[PDB]
Structure 1
Amino acid sequence: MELYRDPSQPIEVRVRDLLSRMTLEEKVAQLGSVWGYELIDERGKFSREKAKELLKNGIGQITRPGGSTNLEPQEAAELVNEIQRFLVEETRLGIPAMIHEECLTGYMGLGGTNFPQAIAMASTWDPDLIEKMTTAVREDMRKIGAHQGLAPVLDVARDPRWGRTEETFGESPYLVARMGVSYVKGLQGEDIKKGVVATVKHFAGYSASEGGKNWAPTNIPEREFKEVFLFPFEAAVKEANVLSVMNSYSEIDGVPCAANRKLLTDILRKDWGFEGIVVSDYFAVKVLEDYHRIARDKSEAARLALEAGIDVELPKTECYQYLKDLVEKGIISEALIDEAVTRVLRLKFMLGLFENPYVEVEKAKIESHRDIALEIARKSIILLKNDGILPLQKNKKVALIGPNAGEVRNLLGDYMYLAHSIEEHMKSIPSVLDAFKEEGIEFEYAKGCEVTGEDRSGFEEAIEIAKKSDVAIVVVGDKSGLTLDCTTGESRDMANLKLPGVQEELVLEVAKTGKPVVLVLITGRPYSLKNVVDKVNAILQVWLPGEAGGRAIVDIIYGKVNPSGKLPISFPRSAGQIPVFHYVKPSGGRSHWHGDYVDESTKPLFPFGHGLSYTKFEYSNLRIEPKEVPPAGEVVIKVDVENIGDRDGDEVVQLYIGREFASVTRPVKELKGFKRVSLKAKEKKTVVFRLHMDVLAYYNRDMKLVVEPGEFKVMVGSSSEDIRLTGSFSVVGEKREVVGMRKFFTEACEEAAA
């Protein structure tokens, strides 16, 4: 028994033994991939004939054996078992494949639950719930033989033009990092042999493209890059031990991320100690030639990507096959191949693949997680505005109007399988209309208009039913996806941030009837609401929700659920205001010296952290101890919060920290902690934040990470603008350079109030 086959030997010994036995061809095959669909016949069964060509020298990964084949879970598991058997039994060394799938919003294939989008996950401000979600995704994926999920997205989004906004956790490095670490922890085990490799993406800066345009340059200076864009990735690497990273398609200031050794190696591996695999975004290696025009041919693209630190070329081997020729012609050293192969093999051994690469098909049926999806949807919906009309009385006659009220497709996000037997599977998802029926509401429905186009012919019918109702509920927003008819999603960037089509005019026409209007936004991004805000009575933001969307919206409208979502991204008044974010410097978020633009406020229409409730929360009794702390000390901040209203509800208590008179300019306020707290009517609790000085560190003039003596402002409240209590503490002592491992997060919890 060769050492590499022996499970009693340490992983490093198995790796070295395997590597020593491999040919150059075999090594290079471990750095590539093949699509699931390329390995099946027309009946969706594994094809040995195709495998003999594509897998004869082994393979790094199979791309989306469920997601790209439209197979049901048991049939996907059977395909995966057969691929694995061919590798284990019909190749010289018997190295098994790693399988990856998309899974941002749940496993992206037939049979998987469609959870609400990432931006909705962030809107819950509930990291534990997100960990529970990915723990369930982990089980789904392992059932079908998948080992790696391409999620989560840790890009920090402050540009709502960008069509991938919906896939992020919003604008706050702190919130994005906190949600990201929980997301990763749920997917990955403690022991990865029993979990799923998480893939943080897109490293790094991809959400800050020129003009919000997909793949356009992301030109970010160093301090901002470290504190805003890299921070969530750093936390995922160091605190959550994430095992995969995927690169950004964009260039930073002249260098494409896929060709950048300073980013993918010097920061990620050298500075941070990342030990897992870097996988390319799909075709990211090839487009070094085709799009960026910095590689003359496929073999130069391969060289740049391998040197940069990309281990596996996805979704199919294209350039990496030429790594063989580059070694044979003495252009690159085989040692650099060996380094990448080591990282791939290490992970395959840790996943348990050499001991057992198969799954039990009989157990491969994926269970529904509608319960988890519905809890996220209920906690994610945000009440942006309410003059008092909500919650509605069940006896009011409703005119239900708009394209998103009637079309189940438009509840789905860009990486939800049914968006991208299709029609048949779609039929299974509850509509908004269905939720109104089951609630027993008396209503009529008029579509009003389409999501896109200029056709106003449906307006008359919508106006007519509004005139005969007590209240109009107007449901507008996006179709999310990858094609030209979609208004949001990857590749669907929106310059002007107006609701698509004539939906805004539809809202205004309905409002002109003088009936009360509840505006329901089912969207992937913030839209400019400047022209409608004062014309409607209430506004609900529903980030593209699960299969669970309809029920949650209706539950909230009628007050069976008290809304508790808070914005994880600022809502701009208009596109020309971009960007707006809560953590501006003293000179940011304003024009000097008149404050405002000529034609526009510099304040967002709704700020970060905003979200209303059907009850009222009263904050009191701020304590901050001790008042003076040394530069690696800890401060304990306590506030009492009481539900003083008549309905039970959750409040998201938010901690902002401000600093002046540092050696560099600092945010007037930035989010540094938060806690979702449940409060029954008249219940009072204490929220405790334990804030280590490590969490407040920032980069100084010399690019060192420091804590400087001085005063920090503490602001606790219900949004970044609705601050309820303020105080301060001092750091006392000599400037400290923060070296090596440090804390990233405030620890937040609840105690009984006095």
Structure 2
Amino acid sequence: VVPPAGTPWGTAYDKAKAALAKLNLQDKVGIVSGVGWNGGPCVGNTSPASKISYPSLCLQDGPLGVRYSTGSTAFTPGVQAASTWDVNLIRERGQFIGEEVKASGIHVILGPVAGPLGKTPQGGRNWEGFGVDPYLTGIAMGQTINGIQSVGVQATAKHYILNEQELNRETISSNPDDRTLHELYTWPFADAVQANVASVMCSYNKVNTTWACEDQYTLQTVLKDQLGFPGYVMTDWNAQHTTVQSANSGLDMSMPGTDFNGNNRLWGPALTNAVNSNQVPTSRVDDMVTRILAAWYLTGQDQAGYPSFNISRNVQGNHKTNVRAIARDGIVLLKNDANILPLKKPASIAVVGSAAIIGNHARNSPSCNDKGCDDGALGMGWGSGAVNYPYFVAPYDAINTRASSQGTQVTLSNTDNTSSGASAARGKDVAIVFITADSGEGYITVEGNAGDRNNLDPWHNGNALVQAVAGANSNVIVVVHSVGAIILEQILALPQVKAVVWAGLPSQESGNALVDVLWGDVSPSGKLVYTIAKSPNDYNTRIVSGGSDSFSEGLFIDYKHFDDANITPRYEFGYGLSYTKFNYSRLSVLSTAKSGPATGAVVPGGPSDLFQNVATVTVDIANSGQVTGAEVAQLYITYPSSAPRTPPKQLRGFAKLNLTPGQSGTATFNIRRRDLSYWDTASQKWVVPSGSFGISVGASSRDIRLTSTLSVA
């Protein structure tokens, strides 16, 4: 409805209303209408309103840093940040991004990403988000937006909603049932809203046959009325289709204003015309401006002294510490047989694979615009969510420096030639093989991949490369840099493969991060944020070629499908090895949670009680092994069986504890009312069912160490 007084949004609204009263229609139309594709200096720009000292609003990509900048940090993709399971690193990433954005004189950063959530492993842009889980992605969304906006920068929660594949993204209709729409996909956007996100970007796709940027139900009823979003909705780039319907459905901002060619200017003069011809009421436009100006006042951008736009400025500072930390702590150790890792003092190391060295990807090459290539070391996927590297630390260069410092001889085979890799690996103590898979936004086809991936195999003949190295060496370590799940069964069937390092997407700090882990300066502590199956056929969704995706799987995506269908994955959601072991004890559940619908008045996030704590689950974690390591403890909740069909397990908590040998620590999971709720379609309300909730705590979604119950009368 409207934000409550005495809150940041409430005060922003008071300011916004006073500013609105000083404006005429042209002022207002200029505020809501982008100047045109490449019409201003930024990715998006609106028209200034000097009467209220409102600048031309400057909007820039993206979720991992400042796009087109030559003096900015390339932060890790969101998927790597979520792979840390570290709320502190996640918030810091947001803060550091915020700092660079403001320092570059940009008002709005186009991120973080809650949509796509990532139901299909082949999804081209899943890596921009925070994994497959709505709870984790939601927590990550909230932490990142707190971080960004604490600096005084506007964040943009995108893409709203159901943009789960790149193929035909501008035409396909996503048609899930109501409960699925709310309880799975909308969930993380509620976290974003509750975090006071300034803006939300509507998606390219249709939702139940209606384009997302024209959908009254999702934009007005769900986002604005049910989630109580007080900010503004912008379109993805040329995702607007009508002048009048888009406006009346709840669209607030036409971005960038035209199509690539300067056509399809649906607002601007056309909006002026639609208001004058009484097709769009002035009240609607007045609401657009209030939301936009409120976001400006909320972030304090009205105050004198905001830096001017300049993406040539070196705004990096020491922010690389975050990239280093996340690239490092987001690595998932998948296999460590015979404890080959960490490496001690081997006489010789073979380094094999084109992905070991600097290539056109790391170099910001003319052959790799928008990072549309997997050439040499990989740090992120491609598209609007990619940025320029200020530098790039290749795995090889970092491995060579560390190994040479201890007398270890390094032999490099820097291509993906199987015979060269064999020659390099022959007679060496260990062989480290580098493989990749890449994907991105659906306007670039890279090596026959239209955005989404064609398959879940390693690129550049990675499987055959590993097989050749295994023919020549007993002690193979496989390092994988990837936008998502790869079927590892061919690699795992080779007895010579002793270690598998799921390194993820490390950006500029690739090599340093890997060495930290490989040599055991730190223990790996990342855990998977998606399921790695034994077969491509174990996944229950595919990239759809037709005009419709019925989302027939409903609530059962990724690990929820694997649990429901009784399928054993190779590596489950929340799985990660360490150089040490941890044990869990002393499970306690404190709860005052009461059943029924949420009852609080709608504020940002929904009814005011939904994000409030109703319960607390606690476990002790001790490092029982030989070395220092951080453990990610996970809480999974099973709803009463009397409640409507729900996945058997749902992530509803996580904690990360660094523990030296013999150290014990407390993991505390705070449970919000919504964490015990399901969406009831008939009443359009979040409801806590009565009964006994299963409480499961452990090291992964399958490695449950302790169980208890939470009882709701």
Answer yes or no: same fold by TM over 0.5: yes
- TM-score computed with the length of structure 2 as normaliser: 0.83
**Pick aligned residue for 2:75 from 115, 124, 139:** 115
1:202-229 deviation line (CA, Å, top 9, x unaligned):
111212x498978633222111111111
Closer, same or farther: CA 386–236 of 1 in aligned 2, 3 Å = same
| 3-state SS of paired residue (2:458) | coil
Residue 512 of structure 1 corresponds to 471
Residue 352 of structure 2 corresponds to 401
**508-517 vs 575-584, which moves further:** 575-584
1:380-425 deviation line (CA, Å, top 9, x unaligned):
00001111221122324111111211135243324699955x7xx6
1:261: how far off?
1.0
C-alpha distance in structure 2 between counterparts of 1:175 and 1:714, whole Å = 17
Residue 647 of structure 1 corresponds to 627
Closer, same or farther: CA 182–544 of 1 in aligned 2, 3 Å = same
C-alpha distance in structure 2 between counterparts of 1:126 and 1:591, whole Å = 25
Closer, same or farther: CA 280–474 of 1 in aligned 2, 3 Å = same
C-alpha distance in structure 2 between counterparts of 1:631 and 1:442, whole Å = 65
What is the identity, as a one-letter code, of the residue corresponding to 1:670?
Answer: Q
Residue 341 of structure 1 corresponds to 289
C-alpha distance in structure 2 between counterparts of 1:161 and 1:245, whole Å = 25
Residue 304 of structure 1 corresponds to 245
C-alpha distance in structure 2 between counterparts of 1:589 and 1:333, whole Å = 46
Residues 218-297 of structure 1 aligned to structure 2 (within 5 Å): 218-238=174-194, 240-285=195-240, 288=241
**Pick aligned residue for 1:444 from 401, 404, 411:** 411
2:428–2:473 contact (8 Å) kept in structure 1: no
Aligned length: 640
C-alpha distance in structure 2 between counterparts of 1:540 and 1:179, whole Å = 24
What is the identity, as a one-letter code, of the residue corresponding to 1:668?
Answer: P
C-alpha distance in structure 1 between counterparts of 2:430 and 2:155, whole Å = 46
C-alpha distance in structure 1 between counterparts of 2:219 and 2:506, whole Å = 34
Residue 130 of structure 1 corresponds to 90
Matched, 1:178 2:158: no
1:540: how far off?
0.9
C-alpha distance in structure 2 between counterparts of 1:160 and 1:487, whole Å = 18
Matched, 1:566 2:527: yes
- TM-score computed with the length of structure 1 as normaliser: 0.78
C-alpha distance in structure 2 between counterparts of 1:588 and 1:184, whole Å = 27
C-alpha distance in structure 2 between counterparts of 1:591 and 1:647, whole Å = 33
Matched, 1:385 2:365: no
1:693-721 deviation line (CA, Å, top 9, x unaligned):
54211134735422222111111110011
2:614–2:671 contact (8 Å) kept in structure 1: yes
Residues 13-162 of structure 1 aligned to structure 2 (within 5 Å): 15-16=16-17, 18-34=19-35, 38-39=39-40, 62-63=42-43, 95-108=54-67, 109-155=69-115, 156-162=117-123
C-alpha distance in structure 1 between counterparts of 2:679 and 2:51, whole Å = 52
C-alpha distance in structure 2 between counterparts of 1:183 and 1:99, whole Å = 20
C-alpha distance in structure 2 between counterparts of 1:556 and 1:402, whole Å = 19
Closer, same or farther: CA 383–145 of 1 in aligned 2, 3 Å = same
C-alpha distance in structure 1 between counterparts of 2:284 and 2:554, whole Å = 44
Closer, same or farther: CA 585–413 of 1 in aligned 2, 3 Å = closer
1:686: how far off?
2.8
Matched, 1:528 2:495: no
2:379–2:510 contact (8 Å) kept in structure 1: no
Residue 689 of structure 1 corresponds to 669
**Pick aligned residue for 2:321 from 358, 371, 387:** 371
1:245–1:277 contact (8 Å) kept in structure 2: yes
Residues 477-626 of structure 1 aligned to structure 2 (within 5 Å): 477-479=436-438, 484=444, 486=446, 492-535=451-494, 536-579=497-540, 584=556, 589=561, 602-625=567-590
1:660–1:666 contact (8 Å) kept in structure 2: no
What is the identity, as a one-letter code, of the residue corresponding to 1:378?
Answer: R
Residue 319 of structure 1 corresponds to 266
1:480–1:488 contact (8 Å) kept in structure 2: no
Q: Which runs of 5+ in 2 are unaligned?
A: 1-10, 259-264, 362-376, 542-552, 597-612
**125-134 vs 342-351, which moves further:** 342-351
**101-110 vs 458-467, which moves further:** 101-110
C-alpha distance in structure 1 between counterparts of 2:563 and 2:381, whole Å = 36
**254-263 vs 351-360, which moves further:** 351-360
Closer, same or farther: CA 730–350 of 1 in aligned 2, 3 Å = closer
C-alpha distance in structure 2 between counterparts of 1:587 and 1:472, whole Å = 33
2:37–2:257 contact (8 Å) kept in structure 1: no
2:62–2:384 contact (8 Å) kept in structure 1: no
Closer, same or farther: CA 514–666 of 1 in aligned 2, 3 Å = same
What is the identity, as a one-letter code, of the residue corresponding to 1:661?
Answer: S
2:169–2:204 contact (8 Å) kept in structure 1: no
1:113: how far off?
1.0
1:165: how far off?
1.3
1:381–1:563 contact (8 Å) kept in structure 2: yes
Larger Rg: 1
Residue 434 of structure 1 corresponds to 397
C-alpha distance in structure 2 between counterparts of 1:663 and 1:670, whole Å = 14
What is the identity, as a one-letter code, of the residue corresponding to 2:413?
Answer: A
1:661: how far off?
2.3
**11-20 vs 504-513, which moves further:** 11-20
Q: Which runs of 5+ in 1 are unaligned?
A: 1-9, 41-61, 66-82, 289-300, 450-457, 597-601, 733-754
Closer, same or farther: CA 196–226 of 1 in aligned 2, 3 Å = same
2:582–2:622 contact (8 Å) kept in structure 1: yes
Closer, same or farther: CA 677–707 of 1 in aligned 2, 3 Å = same
1:673: how far off?
0.6
Residue 418 of structure 2 corresponds to 459
Closer, same or farther: CA 716–583 of 1 in aligned 2, 3 Å = farther
What is the identity, as a one-letter code, of the residue corresponding to 2:459?
Answer: P
Residue 727 of structure 1 corresponds to 708
Closer, same or farther: CA 429–219 of 1 in aligned 2, 3 Å = same
1:488–1:525 contact (8 Å) kept in structure 2: no
1:172-220 deviation line (CA, Å, top 9, x unaligned):
111011111000000112xxxx51111111111212x498978633222
C-alpha distance in structure 2 between counterparts of 1:591 and 1:613, whole Å = 24
1:589–1:603 contact (8 Å) kept in structure 2: no
1:607-633 deviation line (CA, Å, top 9, x unaligned):
00000000011122323346x965499
1:412–1:419 contact (8 Å) kept in structure 2: no
1:19: how far off?
3.9
1:116–1:543 contact (8 Å) kept in structure 2: no
Residue 50 of structure 1 corresponds to none
Matched, 1:198 2:155: yes
C-alpha distance in structure 2 between counterparts of 1:120 and 1:718, whole Å = 19
C-alpha distance in structure 2 between counterparts of 1:104 and 1:165, whole Å = 12
2:37–2:256 contact (8 Å) kept in structure 1: no
1:138–1:188 contact (8 Å) kept in structure 2: yes
Relative contact order, CA 8 A, sep 6+: which one is greater? 2
1:234-262 deviation line (CA, Å, top 9, x unaligned):
12212x11111001211122111111011
1:282–1:315 contact (8 Å) kept in structure 2: yes
1:142: how far off?
1.4
Identity %: 29
1:550: how far off?
0.7
Closer, same or farther: CA 416–613 of 1 in aligned 2, 3 Å = farther
Closer, same or farther: CA 506–313 of 1 in aligned 2, 3 Å = same
Matched, 1:331 2:279: yes
1:31–1:311 contact (8 Å) kept in structure 2: yes
2:152–2:301 contact (8 Å) kept in structure 1: no
